[PDB]
Design an enzyme around this catalytic site. Sequence first.
Site, short mmCIF file in Angstrom:
data_model
loop_
_atom_site.label_atom_id
_atom_site.label_comp_id
_atom_site.label_asym_id
_atom_site.label_seq_id
_atom_site.Cartn_x
_atom_site.Cartn_y
_atom_site.Cartn_z
N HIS A 41 0.82 -0.95 0.13
CA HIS A 41 0.07 -0.06 0.23
C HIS A 41 0.82 1.12 -0.10
O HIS A 41 0.22 2.48 -0.21
CB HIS A 41 -1.48 0.14 1.55
CG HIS A 41 -0.52 0.15 2.58
ND1 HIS A 41 -0.58 -0.86 3.50
CD2 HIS A 41 0.25 1.48 3.30
CE1 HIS A 41 -0.88 0.24 4.69
NE2 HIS A 41 0.04 1.02 4.32
N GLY A 143 2.90 5.93 11.05
CA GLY A 143 3.92 5.73 10.51
C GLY A 143 4.88 4.47 10.85
O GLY A 143 6.15 4.37 10.68
N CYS A 145 3.53 1.42 9.41
CA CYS A 145 3.66 0.63 9.50
C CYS A 145 4.56 -0.10 7.90
O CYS A 145 5.63 0.91 8.25
CB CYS A 145 3.04 0.54 7.54
SG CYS A 145 0.74 1.37 8.30
#
Lengths: 306, 306
Positions: A41, A143, A145
């Site tokens: 993503h 942040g 991820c």
Amino acid sequence: SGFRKMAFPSGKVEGCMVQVTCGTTTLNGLWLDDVVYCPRHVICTSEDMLNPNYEDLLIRKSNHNFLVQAGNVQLRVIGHSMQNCVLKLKVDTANPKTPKYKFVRIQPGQTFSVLACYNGSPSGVYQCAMRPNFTIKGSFLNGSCGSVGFNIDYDCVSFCYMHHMELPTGVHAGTDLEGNFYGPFVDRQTAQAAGTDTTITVNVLAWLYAAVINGDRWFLNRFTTTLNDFNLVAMKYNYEPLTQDHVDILGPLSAQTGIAVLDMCASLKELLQNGMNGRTILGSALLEDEFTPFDVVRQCSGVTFQ
Amino acid sequence: SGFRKMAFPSGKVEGCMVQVTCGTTTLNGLWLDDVVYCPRHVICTSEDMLNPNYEDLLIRKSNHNFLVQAGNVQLRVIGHSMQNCVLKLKVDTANPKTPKYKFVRIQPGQTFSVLACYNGSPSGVYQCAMRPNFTIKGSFLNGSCGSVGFNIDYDCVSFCYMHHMELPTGVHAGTDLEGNFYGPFVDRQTAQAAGTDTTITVNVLAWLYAAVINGDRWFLNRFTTTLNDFNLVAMKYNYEPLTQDHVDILGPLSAQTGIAVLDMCASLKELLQNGMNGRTILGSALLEDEFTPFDVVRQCSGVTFQ
């Protein structure tokens, strides 16, 4: 003596964390040999996330659209591919700090350590379990991820989780390192939500054994139970069924303490029906389910990792 | 979202751990530049520990009586000295993995991460607080002596604890890295015991702020209290007095949440008098006191460490 939530030492993983930027999105990636792994993503804009076609989005990208930063050093991306929900960026340099490692997909009820990272830089380490509903109760901010979960076995890092997103109840969802989600979740903005969760019975029993090992027996009793009769109570209290394989797994803790597994089940049954009556176990006023039998043996026996 | 007991990433410390042997005793040491730091009781036999004179015991040792092993490599000891209760072994090689570091003596109520080690090899990482009675509730088995506690600030490791021994109640005692014990303890076999402990009030308040930040307010009320009136209740419940400096320290969390410090004190007072009524806060059924205000800000705001 003592019993703490204990994470694996994180140094082998710290040396693998990098920052990945695509467009306006920056998140974390995992650099092993000449490949950086991150959530796919990263290639999406917010509008893309409503209904992305990742094949169509990725074919439009060039290698120079991906900025990878390891410390103060830019790594040049020389190829890319997608495996399930993970993007794999081939870079022109192999990570000299790559540890011995494997990728492993874990079962619900297993535990792992998380190295929470922001902008490629480690912030903290904590211990989690994969819940029966395939979420984790992590601690993750914007942040995070791309942060990973792992276990260590001797000198080998077994990576088992990569963080992808937060669900509406504040719990977290992610993938194995081959990009397959745990649970039914998808990397798209939908109404998906965590399903009803249950308590990990075999882990509660392991922790009661840890309490006995550390010298506390107040919750034991003179009763036993059948496996079937125990599971009738477990179902009533939203506990996972206890299987014969779970009983077998608890064998060593049972042998070490002299408390038969089904006798410990009778103690847990009484704790569920009567509560803890203002008492504590291993410093907790509730029954703890994020220690596996292996975790207890490791912490009560002292295994190391070189 | 989420809130976990979170340790600092341990990699900078892992690269400093070594094994020290003297006679039949093996424990852990900390290798920084060309010095290895370890508990001076490594030089004692069990008979020595009844009433050791360390000056007299150490003058009888030669450099070759100390075996230091870093991984698979023996380090040659070329000098030794004693500083308070820490032995400093000068070795012929500077540790190439020495991080930026400082030695810091902490106050009670401060938290730190522990890297538990056995035979020089890290086993796990967990978060502790220095209790008001100058013990820690660690998780340590035989052979853990010499394991260290630390905090990280940007890139600098501040070492604050070295493990020396377990007390009769199963809690732990140790020194700063300059060899001074926390508390009244001595490195001799005596009847010493942990004194009565108290709860770290400023930390409980910080954790209630963390709970509000993470979206839970059930325990708030419409009341306020004076500092003096709150401390009368704290004394009754074996809580540490709350000082004006503690109120000042909580300022930022108060500003972020919109809850005045003394209003949060009124909520804690009601929680102490009425209990939690079967409810939980941040997944706990008791009031947690091992998160400092700084710990809450770090985990709710996302600070990293390069």
